[PDB]
């Protein structure tokens, strides 16, 4: 009635049979076993495992509903406890996401325009280094934050600025640790560990601290607030709390304000800025690659002026290697979990409604059917015989369905914004010889080797 599963013992689950090296390696040692759609115990609950791009399509596209209910995620869960626009559920979720939606698409300058000018603030930054070593960590972290910080507090930060680091250095502490071993330990037992000390209780007091600054950004937005002309996310939201003041059965209330605003910097940061950290770093090993790149840069935009998100349609080339760099990238692989709304009918098996889906979004992207050579840099993977860009149904990075990633447009727009605005204006060079680089890297996230990387200016 469920699908094929290895035999638990009570209370500690699956257990013998998981895979030391982490979940994700654990999930993919079973499906050799026990084929692309299967059931482990994570303890005393179990959860339905989807491998493969079919699986994924026929359960999140097909099933679209019956798999559209999120999961906790047991380190974050206090903190969340199923408010915010990425761990809600029903109506609460759906309000939500249809508010969140709506909202980013509007400092009254588009979305377009304050990535390419956060993108001239990077330029700007890059070359005062003046061809130092330097490790773009940093850096990568602060361009992504003052996109959403733009969206919701309506304003961005110098990236010398010693406040906003601090808040930004404990907010991605907290991520680092997320996806720790520990974290994945806490997961499975966490009933038992969360009287003991251990990286939650660290994972906790960061979130609390940012959530207090959050607060506080509501408050002073509030007593600022011009209804007749909002400024960001927050104001809106606002004048929709004022709107809803006469009914108590209303989503739109202070604790799902700030769990939204965490919401938004969680999912909008992070992912976006190991893509260009992994991006960089495959594009140091790959020289051949990058130089292509410029050149197509040099082609179609020149050396003048800068890059505009309508110049990617006319550049199939850089498109393709985003492409791909998101691919291998792999940066959330085995995803944000899932969960049925409903007893669903699958596969012939039985999904009992609230029964936890894991989407493995690394099997699709290394589907062989999908992709030629799975474990290679291959930016081919995304070009026809006439060298123009071809999307891949087993290109998923931002999930499917319902809960399809809501950032989706933004993301993309960053990636591309961001590479070619480096790119047109600096080389790159770092100590390490490309042959002797290495990408192999970690839990729900991945997370690459940090390097070091030159930015050489280029006139
Ligand atoms: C390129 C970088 C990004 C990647 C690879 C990425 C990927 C993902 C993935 C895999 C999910 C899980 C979807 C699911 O299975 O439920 C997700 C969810 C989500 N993403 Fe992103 N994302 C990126 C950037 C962003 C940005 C920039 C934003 C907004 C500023 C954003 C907003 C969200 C939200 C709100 C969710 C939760 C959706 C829901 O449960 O309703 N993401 N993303
Ligand atoms: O000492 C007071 C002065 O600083 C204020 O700037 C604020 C800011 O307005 C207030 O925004 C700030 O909070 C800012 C930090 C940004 C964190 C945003 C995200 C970063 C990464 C992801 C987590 C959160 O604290 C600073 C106070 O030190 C004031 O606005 C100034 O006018 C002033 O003279
Ligand atoms: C849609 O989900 C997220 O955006 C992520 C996420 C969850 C699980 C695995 C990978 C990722 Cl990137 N959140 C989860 C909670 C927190 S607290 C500070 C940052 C994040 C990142």
């Not at 959403?148 to 406040?163: A, L, M, N, Q, T």
């Not at 006319?314 to 998101?326: G, L, N, S």
């Not at 099997?363 to 123009?388: I, M, V």
Request: charged share 25%; glycine share 6%.
């Amino acid at each position: 009635k469920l699908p094929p599963g290895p035999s638990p013992l009570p209370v500690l689950g699956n257990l013998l049979q998981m895979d030391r090296k982490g979940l994700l390696r654990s999930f993919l040692r079973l499906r050799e076993k026990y084929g692309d759609v299967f059931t482990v115990y994570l303890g005393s609950r179990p959860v339905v495992v989807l491998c493969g791009t079919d699986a994924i399509r026929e359960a999140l596209v097909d099933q679209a509903e019956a798999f559209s209910g999120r999961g906790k995620i047991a380190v974050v869960d206090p903190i969340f406890q199923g408010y915010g626009v990425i761990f809600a559920n029903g109506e609460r979720w759906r309000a939500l996401r249809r508010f969140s939606l709506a909202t980013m698409r509007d400092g009254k300058r588009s979305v377009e325009e304050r990535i390419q000018e956060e993108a001239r603030c990077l330029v700007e930054e890059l070359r005062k280094s003046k061809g130092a070593l330097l490790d773009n960590t940093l850096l990568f972290h602060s361009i992504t934050s003052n996109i959403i910080c733009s969206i919701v507090f309506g304003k961005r930060f110098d990236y010398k600025d010693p406040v906003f680091l601090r808040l930004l250095d404990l907010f991605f502490q907290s991520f680092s640790l997320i996806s720790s071993f520990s974290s994945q330990v806490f997961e499975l037992f966490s009933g038992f560990l969360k009287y003991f000390p251990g990286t939650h209780r660290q994972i906790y007091r960061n979130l609390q601290e940012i959530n207090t600054f959050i607060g506080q950004s509501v408050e002073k937005h509030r007593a600022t607030l011009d209804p007749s002309n909002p400024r960001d996310f927050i104001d809106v939201y606002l004048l929709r709390m004022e709107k809803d003041k006469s009914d108590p059965s209303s989503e739109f209330h202070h604790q799902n304000l700030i769990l939204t605003v965490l919401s938004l910097f969680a999912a909008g940061t992070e992912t976006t800025s190991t893509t260009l950290r992994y991006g960089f770093l495959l594009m140091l090993k790959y020289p051949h690659v990058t130089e292509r790149v410029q050149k197509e840069i040099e082609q179609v935009i020149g050396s003048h002026r800068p890059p505009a998100l309508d110049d990617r349609a006319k550049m199939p080339y850089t498109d393709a290697v985003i492409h791909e760099i998101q691919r291998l990238g792999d940066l959330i692989p085995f995803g944000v979990p899932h969960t049925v709304t409903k007893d669903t009918q699958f596969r012939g098996y039985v999904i009992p409604k609230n029964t936890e889906v894991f989407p493995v979004l690394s099997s699709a992207l290394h589907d062989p059917r999908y992709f030629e050579t799975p474990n290679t840099f291959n930016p081919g993977h995304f070009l026809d015989a006439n060298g123009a860009l071809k999307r891949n149904e087993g290109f998923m990075p931002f999930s499917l369905g319902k809960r399809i990633c809501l950032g989706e447009g933004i993301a993309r727009t960053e990636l591309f914004l961001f590479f070619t605005t480096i790119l047109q204006n600096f080389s790159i060079a770092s100590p390490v010889p490309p042959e002797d680089i290495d990408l192999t890297p970690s839990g729900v996230g991945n997370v690459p080797p940090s390097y070091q990387i030159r930015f050489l200016a280029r006139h």
